[PDB]
RNA sequence: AUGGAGAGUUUGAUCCUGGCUCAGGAUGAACGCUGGCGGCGUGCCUAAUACAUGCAAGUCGAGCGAACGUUAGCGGCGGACGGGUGAGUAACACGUGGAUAACCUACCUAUAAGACUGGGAUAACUUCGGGAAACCGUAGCUAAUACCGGAUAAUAUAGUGAAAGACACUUAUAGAUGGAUCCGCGCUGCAUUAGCUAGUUGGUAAGGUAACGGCUUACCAAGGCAACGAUGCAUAGCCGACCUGAGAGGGUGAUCGGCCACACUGGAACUGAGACACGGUCCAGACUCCUACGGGAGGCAGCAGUAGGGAAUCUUCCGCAAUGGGCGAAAGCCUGACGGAGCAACGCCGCGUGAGUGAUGAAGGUCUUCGGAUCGUAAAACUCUGUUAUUAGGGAGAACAUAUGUGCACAUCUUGACGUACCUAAUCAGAAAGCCACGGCUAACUACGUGCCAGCAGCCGCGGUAAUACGUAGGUGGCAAGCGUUAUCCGGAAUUAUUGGGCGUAAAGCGCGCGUAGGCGGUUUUUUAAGUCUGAUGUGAAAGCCCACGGCUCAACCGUGGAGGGUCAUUGGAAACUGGAA
């Protein structure tokens, strides 16, 4: 019956987390969009996504080689 | 996580002990990494100190821990401050 | 630490690197002691190296990179 | 035979016809399936008694029963005893071993078995066919 | 070499093939009818059926919200390891042997190092309101080693962290540590199951995962599997081991360890290093009760218990003293993990319900033709003994630190549930009894009622009037706290015959051709090295069997070093025979 504290810690945990991960998938969404848009984000947006996978990488909410597949899927597109 | 075995071998009503490199979550008679000797805990033995610790010298020299109040047998040895 | 080194013939080949490798081997039977022979049909991939009816060449096992082929060598010696 | 036709179709041991074939199996209540148990004894309730006569070299006339066991494998089992029991709808405990010369019995009834404790006018049998009152 | 035996039964008699039954060991055994001891190991195998009822992982405020060294709740870890059962699985699930130029990891401890600047917010708290309570929201706060912004730092082709003792937290290289995937060989029965497969088998991408990949979709195409038994049904968790066997072999899988798979049944994710999670959440379904019926609950395959079914397998038990297991600086802490007593004769053994005598010795049983043998030196009634019974001191496993002196190491003060055990010392006669047989296999013989009847039966078979085979009696034989019976396996069985059988008449030759797949091959000379022979390694854990040794009053039982752990793995090596090629 120690779990009845653990019912609402994890709820607050992923309840906070899925917004940050959704902003991680949204923050990377416009980047490879922007290199093929011929837009003004040939800079200043890929480093935003590098901040997103970096700040996500400091938490355990995404694995290391996953972020290597974002970085290896974005800067290698330059 | 690696520790040193003190398991309940022997005849019942006579709790013995065997000294081996164990793990903190595997049980007493569980999976054994390597042997580290034994000791006659019978309290009816004159010659008892059985730790040929050159095959157990790698344990505390690579990240061991003391075991679960067996520290007076760790007192009759002396392997520390050598490094 | 090295790969496998098995040698042996083929049956045929089709398009896209279907380098199947027939291997023949001996074994005793477990009781009667007769020398019984049996085969095994293997797989590996290359560009255009082999053809049908005789392409005995060594193979060497590697990371899988297929659904059945787990050998990465087509190093050729004997053929038709 | 030569070896090539002997590594091809290998040896194949003889079947084991087993004594007490009407046993070893428990037909389940919920799941309604035969099983395998290899059980020494089984219960059962009785239906008839009767007595057929002929045993062609033996020529006396002896009784029998038709017990049927747990989950209705009906059987014919032989009652040991000079006397008998007085009970239809019994709770027997049957026992293997074929009393011969009767065509159609392979089974005993252990005397006692919480239905009838045997015959009272027998002293030196003392475990067979249900006696008592010995202090030997 | 410490290593193997047979008998009965087909006929008026004899050989010979052939079955059938015994004599030996076994066990997670039961049932009858009689029962007193001690030292251990073990107890729903049929229902992975349903759980009335109480109990099986909880700890911690020197970091910060209440009274006079006692409380919160944060949060920090921990519930992914212990424990439990075999339902499913004929599979890279296991067993053995390798591979990572496919890969992961905090908790422990090597280094090389940091904690800068803040700011915002929220539980508790109170208050309101509604609902027999259950569920909840509002209102105003306030914290915190709980969140979060910017600062400058490796590991991507240029990038982020720190809130604690005094005078602890985090960022990298590491080790060990646990994982994950693939590969060669080894994995039961059915041919009265012979055609399977369609993202099925390859390619290029696009993704996605810790990681390659038909793992998923976009096209391109044609494949891939199989008489070296694919697919299908049925049954089965594997293994070092255990039982048997002279050996080859055959049969098992609960104890005790390795590894899977599973937790009312099905799915899918969450936090987390690590679960698609037994004592968690969400969904649908079937059980199950509380019931202002308004909604709201749980999972015995964790200990004991009831109902069931069973041939049958039990305390609704006590305690952390030890061992380890978590937490907490440290005491302390929760533990049906574990340690003990229940309870059963369930096996294994270790003793003793009596002792020196004691004239045919007996009154009374049986044989009797009785004259005498038998129980029988049995018995008395002398002489002999504590094992059981009233009291005793009854005190083996039983250790190790949060300190001070020296420079995490030494000596020196801190901890018992079962409290029976070992003990000694008076000294009783308290039931070592009962089972089964007695014609031969196979030691065990006489009388009485009984007359093919009632009845024994492993096998041949015994009783139709005098049965040593029925039922008693007496005596004898084997047993031993049991005996005997039914049930399963092995040998005997060379009755599945590789060691180690046969096919004329006994069971057994296709009706006889021509023939592919497969099996085997004359003579010689060369080279090779797959089978072959050999030796240097790495390995087949430990507990157990085999002998040696210490200890248990010897015994059952325990610890020590070795056979010894099989077909294997890589190179050295020899080339007579089988391949392989001239
Ligand atoms: Mg005849
Ligand atoms: Mg159930
Ligand atoms: Mg069981
Ligand atoms: Mg019942
Ligand atoms: Mg006898
Ligand atoms: Mg009789
Ligand atoms: Mg013959
Ligand atoms: Mg011909
Ligand atoms: Mg031919
Ligand atoms: Mg060596």
Curated annotation (Swiss-Prot), chain A:
Keywords: Ribonucleoprotein, Ribosomal protein, RNA-binding, rRNA-binding. The keyword Ribonucleoprotein applies. Transmembrane segments: none annotated. InterPro entries: Ribosomal_bS20, Ribosomal_bS20_sf. GO terms for molecular function: small ribosomal subunit rRNA binding; structural constituent of ribosome. GO terms for cellular component: cytosol; small ribosomal subunit. One of its GO terms (biological process) is translation. The keyword Ribosomal protein applies. Gene3D superfamilies: Ribosomal protein S20. PANTHER family: 30S RIBOSOMAL PROTEIN S20, SMALL RIBOSOMAL SUBUNIT PROTEIN BS20C. Binds directly to 16S ribosomal RNA. NCBIfam families: S20. Belongs to the bacterial ribosomal protein bS20 family. This is Small ribosomal subunit protein bS20. It comes from Staphylococcus aureus (strain NCTC 8325 / PS 47). The lineage of its organism: Bacteria, Bacillati, Bacillota, Bacilli, Bacillales. The gene is rpsT.
Swiss-Prot record, chain B:
One of its GO terms (cellular component) is cytoplasm. InterPro entries: Ribosomal_bS16, Ribosomal_bS16_dom_sf. Pfam families: Ribosomal_S16. GO terms for molecular function: structural constituent of ribosome. Keywords: Ribonucleoprotein, Ribosomal protein. It comes from the Bacteria. GO terms for biological process: translation. PANTHER family: 30S RIBOSOMAL PROTEIN S16 (PTHR12919), SMALL RIBOSOMAL SUBUNIT PROTEIN BS16M (PTHR12919:SF20). HAMAP family: Ribosomal_bS16. Belongs to the bacterial ribosomal protein bS16 family. This is Small ribosomal subunit protein bS16. It comes from Staphylococcus aureus (strain NCTC 8325 / PS 47).
UniProtKB/Swiss-Prot annotation, chain C:
InterPro entries: NA-bd_OB-fold, Ribosomal_uS17, Ribosomal_uS17_bact/chlr, Ribosomal_uS17_CS. GO terms for biological process: translation. SUPFAM superfamilies: Nucleic acid-binding proteins. GO terms for cellular component: cytosolic small ribosomal subunit. Part of the 30S ribosomal subunit. Belongs to the universal ribosomal protein uS17 family. HAMAP family: Ribosomal_uS17_B. One of the primary rRNA binding proteins, it binds specifically to the 5'-end of 16S ribosomal RNA. PANTHER family: 40S RIBOSOMAL PROTEIN S11 FAMILY MEMBER (PTHR10744), SMALL RIBOSOMAL SUBUNIT PROTEIN US17M (PTHR10744:SF1). This is Small ribosomal subunit protein uS17.
Swiss-Prot record, chain D:
Signal peptide: none annotated. One of its GO terms (biological process) is translation. Pfam families: Ribosom_S12_S23. The modification 3-methylthioaspartic acid is found at residue 101. CDD domains: Ribosomal_S12. Residues 1-54, 117-136 are annotated as: Disordered. Keywords: Methylation, Ribonucleoprotein, Ribosomal protein, RNA-binding, rRNA-binding, tRNA-binding. GO terms for cellular component: ribosome; small ribosomal subunit. It comes from the Bacteria. The keyword tRNA-binding applies. GO terms for molecular function: rRNA binding; structural constituent of ribosome; tRNA binding. With S4 and S5 plays an important role in translational accuracy. Part of the 30S ribosomal subunit. Contacts proteins S8 and S17. May interact with IF1 in the 30S initiation complex. This is Small ribosomal subunit protein uS12. It comes from Staphylococcus aureus (strain NCTC 8325 / PS 47).
């Amino acid at each position: 019956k120690s779990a009845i504290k653990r019912v609402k810690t994890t709820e607050k945990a992923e309840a906070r987390n899925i917004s940050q991960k959704s902003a991680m998938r949204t923050a990377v969404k416009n980047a490879k969009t922007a290199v093929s848009n011929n837009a003004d984000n040939k800079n200043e947006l890929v480093s935003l996504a590098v901040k997103l996978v970096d700040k996500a990488a400091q938490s355990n909410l995404i694995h290391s080689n996953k972020a290597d597949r974002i970085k290896s899927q974005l800067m290698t597109a330059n | 996580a690696v520790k040193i075995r003190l398991t309940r071998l022997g005849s019942k009503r006579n709790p013995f002990y065997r000294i081996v490199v164990a793990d903190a979550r595997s049980p007493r008679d569980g999976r054994i990494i390597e042997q580290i000797g034994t000791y006659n805990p019978t309290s009816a033995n004159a010659p008892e100190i059985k730790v040929d610790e050159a095959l157990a010298l790698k344990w505390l020299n690579d990240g061991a821990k003391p075991t679960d109040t067996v520290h007076n047998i760790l007192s009759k040895e002396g392997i520390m401050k050598k490094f | 630490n090295d790969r496998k080194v098995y040698v042996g013939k083929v049956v045929s080949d089709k398009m896209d690197k279907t380098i199947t490798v027939l291997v023949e081997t001996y074994k005793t039977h477990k009781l009667y002691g007769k020398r019984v022979k049996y085969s095994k049909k293997y797989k590996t991939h290359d560009e255009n190296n082999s053809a049908k009816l005789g392409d005995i060449v060594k193979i060497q096992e590697t990371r899988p990179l297929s659904a059945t082929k787990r050998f990465r060598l087509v190093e050729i010696v004997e053929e038709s | 035979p030569t070896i090539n036709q002997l590594v091809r179709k290998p040896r194949q041991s003889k079947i084991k016809k087993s004594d007490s074939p009407a046993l070893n199996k428990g037909f389940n209540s919920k799941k309604k399936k035969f099983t395998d148990l290899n059980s020494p004894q089984k219960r059962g309730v009785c239906t008839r008694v009767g007595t057929m006569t002929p045993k062609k070299p033996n020529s006396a006339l002896r009784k029998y029963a038709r017990v049927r066991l747990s989950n209705n494998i009906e059987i014919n089992a032989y009652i040991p005893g000079i006397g008998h029991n007085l009970q239809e709808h019994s709770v027997v405990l049957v026992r293997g071993g074929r009393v011969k010369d009767l065509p159609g019995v392979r089974y005993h009834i252990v005397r006692g078995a919480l239905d009838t404790s045997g015959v009272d006018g027998r002293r030196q049998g003392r475990s067979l066919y249900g006696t008592k009152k010995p202090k030997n």
